[PDB]
Amino acid sequence: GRTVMEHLQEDSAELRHEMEELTDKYDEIRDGILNMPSMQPYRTNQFIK
RNA sequence: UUUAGAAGGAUUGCCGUCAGGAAAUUAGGUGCGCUUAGCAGUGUACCGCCGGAGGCGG
Known part of the structure; x- marks a missing residue:
């Protein structure tokens, strides 16, 4: 129940993990x-x- | 020198059917209205008169 915004300011791997399987360029984004x-x-x- | 300056909202229409409001009642006691005045003001104006419209007699 959190917004991509809050996770991208802390980089919880919760996202770190989910993006990297679906793309190759989470670092640049x-x-x-x-x-x-x-x-x-x-x-x-x-x-x- | 104005949150500046501009603007077509339009056309059409079937609300309907039915029905038990009902029963009971104590409004009651008391009581000072009241002292003064002139329908006055003038209580209303009449007949005429020539003139023809306009002006004096009683």
């Missing part, structure tokens, strides 16, 4: 969900008040 870029305000348009 976890680094891209744990260091995510932030949204930046860069421009405006006619649809923003």
